[PDB]
Amino acid sequence: LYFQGADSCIQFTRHASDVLLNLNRLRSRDILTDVVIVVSREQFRAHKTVLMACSGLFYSIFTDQLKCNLSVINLDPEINPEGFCILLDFMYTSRLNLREGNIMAVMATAMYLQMEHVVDTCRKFIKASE
């Protein structure tokens, strides 16, 4: 379905989420993935443009004339790979699987990746649990 947008243009309600769904299916099938992110010896295939769109850190890396060419990117090996995996899934789905047992790792990872809305959200949820 569609609706008359605030700019009087036709707007498709599911388009942005459908695009993201299709990009995640591409990732799942390893279609047009152009970077491997390595975290504590675990490898995650992804699309640079998606990473840049969601993360200040990846935005800086991939707009850098030298680093934009890299097909492998290593992160700090103290980063929790599950924390990364949760955030990568968030980038591709809008869904953040936050839990008692993962929230600290997720927040630390989001801080490192410069995903500020996620960091804020983790903070609010930590403060609620005080």
Ligand SMILES: CN(c1ncccc1CNc1nc(Nc2ccc3c(c2)CC(=O)N3)ncc1C(F)(F)F)S(C)(=O)=O
């Ligand atoms: C429309 N669908 C398809 N038709 C033909 C081929 C593939 C698909 C679905 N899969 C994908 N589809 C796309 N893009 C895409 C494609 C076909 C159209 C559209 C988008 C809009 C459209 O009207 N046809 N991108 C990635 C994938 C995926 F999952 F493989 F990684 S469907 C669900 O099977 O009815």
